[PDB]
Amino acid sequence: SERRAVYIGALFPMSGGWPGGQACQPAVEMALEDVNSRRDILPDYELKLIHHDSKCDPGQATKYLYELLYNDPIKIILMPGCSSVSTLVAEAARMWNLIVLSYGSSSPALSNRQRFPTFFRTHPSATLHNPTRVKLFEKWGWKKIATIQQTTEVFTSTLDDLEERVKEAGIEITFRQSFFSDPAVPVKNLKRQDARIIVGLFYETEARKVFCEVYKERLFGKKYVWFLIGWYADNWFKIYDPSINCTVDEMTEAVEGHITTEIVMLNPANTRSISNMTSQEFVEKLTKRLKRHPEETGGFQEAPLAYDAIWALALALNKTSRLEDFNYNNQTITDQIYRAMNSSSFEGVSGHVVFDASGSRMAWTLIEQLQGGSYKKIGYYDSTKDDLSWSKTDKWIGGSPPADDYK
Amino acid sequence: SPPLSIMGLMPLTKEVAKGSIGRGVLPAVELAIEQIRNESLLRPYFLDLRLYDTECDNAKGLKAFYDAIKYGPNHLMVFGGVCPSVTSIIAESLQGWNLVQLSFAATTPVLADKKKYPYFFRTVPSDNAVNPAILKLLKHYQWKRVGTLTQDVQRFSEVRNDLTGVLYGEDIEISDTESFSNDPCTSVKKLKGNDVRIILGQFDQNMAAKVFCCAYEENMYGSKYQWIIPGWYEPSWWEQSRCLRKNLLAAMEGYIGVDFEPLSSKQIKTISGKTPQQYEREYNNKRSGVGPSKFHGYAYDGIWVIAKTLQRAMETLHASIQDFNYTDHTLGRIILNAMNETNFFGVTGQVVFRNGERMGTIKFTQFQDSREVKVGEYNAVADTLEIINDTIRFQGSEPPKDD
Ligand SMILES: *[C@@H]1O[C@H](CO[C@@H]2O[C@@H](C)[C@@H](O)[C@@H](O)[C@@H]2O)[C@@H](O[C@@H]2O[C@H](CO)[C@@H](O[C@H]3O[C@H](CO[C@H]4O[C@H](CO)[C@@H](O)[C@H](O)[C@@H]4O)[C@@H](O)[C@H](O[C@H]4O[C@H](CO)[C@@H](O)[C@H](O)[C@@H]4O)[C@@H]3O)[C@H](O)[C@H]2NC(C)=O)[C@H](O)[C@H]1NC(C)=O
Ligand SMILES: *[C@@H]1O[C@H](CO[C@@H]2O[C@@H](C)[C@@H](O)[C@@H](O)[C@@H]2O)[C@@H](O[C@@H]2O[C@H](CO)[C@@H](O[C@H]3O[C@H](CO)[C@@H](O)[C@H](O)[C@@H]3O)[C@H](O)[C@H]2NC(C)=O)[C@H](O)[C@H]1NC(C)=O
Ligand SMILES: C[C@H](NC[C@H](O)CP(=O)(O)CC1CCCCC1)c1ccc(Cl)c(Cl)c1
Ligand SMILES: *[C@@H]1O[C@H](CO)[C@@H](O)[C@H](O)[C@H]1NC(C)=O
């Protein structure tokens, strides 16, 4: 007769490196209202939220993790956002037999089952770009690839994964260059080695420095293809930076024709998901709940993943159905939710939700090309089904893509 | 007699390898505590050190810290943190509970970042503290050109990265920078090819035997060469594939080892009334069957840093403790300012901090036929070097030239 309250301990980054909690906390709150109003999901239970602002800071998150674990009520799951916060809470979690479900962490290192044995994420790993990269090389028949990276853990781990994945496809990494803050030497070294197909992994500030150096060494043109990450701001190369010698037009010239990969976070299709919403309705509903405009709201694009994280948990808890008896000293309930979480398969606002063996999200990637200083959608790739959605909108100088070597 | 509770954090279990640091330092801690108590230095109060085992593990370490806050007494500060990843986690969160931390064994340079770790202090010099000592050694012998050989592991690359800033604006050129992961021979051949004579090495004990085998094969040893490498390896580390033991020893001959000084060599009375030598005898008696630890003097001086800090803190409150809960920002700030004033002569030499970092003593050693022998010491406070007159030796008529 009485619905028993079951609690999620969540951490939301309202500020810091990725202030994703700005749109992910209302997306989570919306999903809890939607799950609780559905009588076919958890009829005997009411999913409640206890949350704190991590400020995308592990030090700050350490204080709130304590507050979550050492204060009643007992929480059945932890929900962090930032990778630095998830690395702390996902490693600590085994001491309280707690499942950890992140809505925003991209760090490849979180796919380690030894360090993070109860971790899942609706946000994919940064390594999800690599199967799309190998498939693009296979499509345009390239077996010799160069790699330039900024010295950061994520880019190092992503390239380490790119190495084992190219070997599987009979493709080899010719040259690997790295920089801390100033490129110039790796860019100079790329012209030196006559590298043609180049995968560049860096943040937006460093991307500008890279492409200004690309200009001077004339590393752009018909001879080369640059493979970059697709989550920089619109017109990132046009952005004014006092530390760049090159101009707007110079940068616009250096960036022409480069390819980008990015994770599909909102289903492009007009279909209805498990909530019975469309992608466009989710967006409209979320915008109403926000104090500021979507463009001024941190984590707006990731918000569907936070919404879907709640549904993945609700469906998992639904599959298990003795939730009030959960204790930090016991593994029995944890192991059952682990099993249910592992076997997730449903349609969310971000598309089809499935985790791999590491508990990392499997999703579509959007492939884009910079055509005339603007990005055009040239395709989509589904790693699990080896399905490439190709639109005949890709364009190259001389009507065709170049080759990897001398020819 | 009200308590002044301190949260002791360290690996203590026999099952955990670094449990030997925590157990090896406890007799030193017991000696300092016992003295301070007899002398009623903290009268009316008494020092209440509570011990919690981190097990040298991130998850267990964090749970030990959390359990100490939940079920333990109201601790005024943290004493310890031995393992680098556990200490980084606790150190970064300190401000959340207004807890000042004093470590005696965490040497990772990362902890010097006062933006990330503002409430963290340490009595032990960090892995980077050898770099100002090496600069003085180079200046002493007129070595203006050096080569570097570094293992591609964070522990070593941190040290090499700091060397850049230490040698900037000094008349010392790093003519060749070489890195390696598993086999140093390629890099050793590049050093030879670039005619490097003075090599600053940063690599583990296992890689050192490989480095010296490559040095024998490339003839990078004898009167024309000086290897300056870590001084923290275990004794007989070389004894423990292509080279012969006699050939390894011939290439190892004369290498300079650099590490922090475990205890002061000055026969002067310290804050406790005992000379470092008298303290060392008292520690060796008290330890019984427990294996000694090179951090024992750092742990002993650490207790004295806490007692002297609490004294200054008690004076500051009297110039205007029980009510302190992790809530009191002002008391944590008083404790933080009090610790920053630390200035006494301890068993490890003069105990002073520079932005939470220990200004201490660096020991120089030289491999002479069968073992490392002390050849000198660098005093970081004074920025001075003292070479032991008739110990350090060279195979030629003069020390080597740098080109
Ligand atoms: C998943 O999605 C849609 C959601 O619909 C809309 O979207 C939300 C975001 C909100 O804005 C909602 O307010 C909004 O409805 C659901 O589809 C609708 O749901 C019902 C399903 O039956 C439909 O409602 C009426 O359906 C019939 C006849 O509809 C006729 O008229 C429309 C145009 O007005 C035509 O397009 C249709 O082809 C058709 O000719 C009607 O008989 C029902 O009316 C009542 O009849 C009885 C009379 O005795 C009453 O006693 C009852 O109250 C009964 O309801 C419905 O009013 C509605 O048209 C569809 N709309 C669409 C676009 O398909 C969908 O069902 C939902 N799935 C769930 C909840 O699982
Ligand atoms: C944290 O400690 C810093 C160092 O303090 C000094 O060393 C301790 C071991 C102890 O002996 C303490 O009493 C010493 O002051 C503090 O920085 C120092 O601040 C001093 C000013 O209070 C400054 O000194 C000045 O003294 C005269 C002034 O005309 C001059 O002779 C001298 O040139 C200085 O200007 C001293 O330089 C400065 N130290 C350094 C290395 O910068 C710091 O303020 C303190 N903070 C606290 C307690 O909150
Ligand atoms: C797609 C991705 N989503 C969130 C990301 O996984 C959070 P993260 O994994 O914690 C990495 C952040 C932290 C530092 C600054 C930006 C990246 C992302 C990546 C880079 C940027 Cl700039 C944004 Cl806004 C979003
Ligand atoms: C929730 O679990 C029940 C129990 O079997 C099931 O009938 C129901 O369909 C599940 N809900 C969803 C939407 O899968």
Domain ranges in chain B are 1-125+266-360, 126-265+361-403
Question: What is the C-alpha to C-alpha distance for residues A365 and A362, in angstroms, rounded to an integer?
Answer: 10
- DSSP string for B214-245: HHHHTT--STT-EEEEES-SPTTTTT---S-H
**A59 touching B (Cβ < 8 Å):** yes
Question: What is the C-alpha to C-alpha distance for residues A192 and A266, in angstroms, rounded to an integer?
Answer: 42
Q: Is the CB of B341 under 6 A from ligand 2?
A: yes
**A87 touching B (Cβ < 8 Å):** no
A153 labelled as ligand-binding?
no
Burial class (CB in 10 A: 0-12, 13-18, 19+), A351: buried
List beta partners, residue B79: B8, B102
List beta partners, residue B362: B260, B378
CATH architecture for residues A1-124+269-363: 3-Layer(aba) Sandwich (3.40)
Structural domain boundaries in chain A: 1-124+269-363, 125-268+364-407
Cβ within 8 Å, pair B66-A70: yes
Question: What is the C-alpha to C-alpha distance for residues B281 and B284, in angstroms, rounded to an integer?
Answer: 5
Q: How far is the CA of B356 from the centre of ligand 2 (A)?
A: 14
B271-279, long-range: CB < 8 A, 24+ apart: B271/B304, B271/B308, B271/B344, B271/B345, B271/B346, B272/B32, B272/B35, B272/B304, B272/B347, B274/B347, B276/B347, B276/B348, B279/B31, B279/B347
List beta partners, residue B230: B258
**Backbone gaps in chain A, preceding residues (C–N over 2.5 A):** 321
Distances (CA, A) of B398 to A21, B253, B395: 66, 16, 8
Structure tokens at B263: 């205890």
Instruction: Report which DSSP code applies to B292.
Output: P
Structure tokens at B335: 């404790």
H or E element at residue B134: helix B130-141
Encode burial over B48-80: b for 16+ CB neighbours within 10 A, e otherwise: ebebbbbbbbbbbbbbbbbebbeeeebbbbbbb
Crossing angle for the helix pair B58-71 and B84-93, nearest 10 degrees?
A: 40
Locus of tokens 């989509």: A380
Is residue B296 within 8 Å of B22, Cβ to Cβ? no
Distances (CA, A) of B175 to A103, B134, B149, B181: 49, 16, 12, 21
Burial class (CB in 10 A: 0-12, 13-18, 19+), B129: buried
Question: What is the C-alpha to C-alpha distance for residues B80 and A43, in angstroms, rounded to an integer?
Answer: 50
User: What is the nearest CA distance from A327 to chain B, expressed in angstroms?
Assistant: 16
Locus of tokens 């010799």: A144
Instruction: Report which DSSP code applies to B165.
Output: H
Yes or no: is domain B1-125+266-360 CATH 3.40.50.2300? yes
Q: Measured between beta carbons, which residues in chain B are less than 8 angstroms from residue A91?
A: 58-59
Do the two domains B1-125+266-360 and B126-265+361-403 of this chain adopt the same fold? yes
Backbone φ, ψ for residue A337 (5° rounding): -70, -35
Per CATH, the homologous superfamily of domain A125-268+364-407 is: Response regulator (3.40.50.2300)
Do the two domains A1-124+269-363 and A125-268+364-407 of this chain adopt the same fold? yes
Cβ within 8 Å, pair A59-B116: yes
Question: What is the C-alpha to C-alpha distance for residues B252 and B363, in angstroms, rounded to an integer?
Answer: 18
Q: Is the CB of A104 under 6 A from ligand 3?
A: yes
List beta partners, residue A48: A7
From the list B168, B165, B163, the residue with the least C-alpha distance to B177 is B163
List beta partners, residue A260: A228, A368
Question: What is the C-alpha to C-alpha distance for residues B171 and B148, in angstroms, rounded to an integer?
Answer: 16
Distances (CA, A) of A157 to A136, B24, B391: 20, 38, 48
Structure tokens at A164: 């084992």
Cβ within 8 Å, pair A62-B63: no
User: What is the nearest CA distance from A183 to chain B, expressed in angstroms?
Assistant: 17
Is residue A6 within 8 Å of A48, Cβ to Cβ? yes
Question: What is the C-alpha to C-alpha distance for residues A62 and B116, in angstroms, rounded to an integer?
Answer: 13
Encode burial over A390-401: b for 16+ CB neighbours within 10 A, e otherwise: eeeebeeeeeeb
Encode burial over A80-90: b for 16+ CB neighbours within 10 A, e otherwise: bbbbbbbbbbb
**Backbone gaps in chain B, preceding residues (C–N over 2.5 A):** 240, 320
Locus of tokens 């395709």: A379
Most A CBs within 10 Å, among B60, B66, B70, to test the A interface: B66
Query: Other CB atoms closer than 10 Å to residue B240's CB: what's the count?
Result: 9
Structure tokens at B281: 């005898």
Chain centroid, CA B87 distance in Å: 14
Question: What is the C-alpha to C-alpha distance for residues A237 and A217, in angstroms, rounded to an integer?
Answer: 17
> Vertex B257, ends B253 and B258: CA angle to 5°?
165
Fold designation for B126-265+361-403: Rossmann fold (3.40.50)
From the list A342, A345, A344, A325, the residue with the least C-alpha distance to A333 is A325
Distances (CA, A) of A344 to A41, A309, A310, A357, A406: 14, 11, 12, 12, 48
Question: Positive or negative, the Cα torsion across B15, B17, B18, B21?
Answer: positive
Question: What is the C-alpha to C-alpha distance for residues B75 and B68, in angstroms, rounded to an integer?
Answer: 8
Is residue A286 within 8 Å of A26, Cβ to Cβ? yes
Q: Is the CB of A41 under 6 A from ligand 4?
A: yes
Question: In terms of DSSP H, where are the helices of B220-324?
Answer: 245-252, 276-286, 296-318
Question: What is the C-alpha to C-alpha distance for residues A32 and A310, in angstroms, rounded to an integer?
Answer: 7
Is residue A384 within 8 Å of A354, Cβ to Cβ? yes
Structure tokens at A264: 């599909």
Question: What is the C-alpha to C-alpha distance for residues A24 and A300, in angstroms, rounded to an integer?
Answer: 7
Q: How far is the CA of A284 from the centre of ligand 1 (A)?
A: 20
**A91 touching B (Cβ < 8 Å):** yes
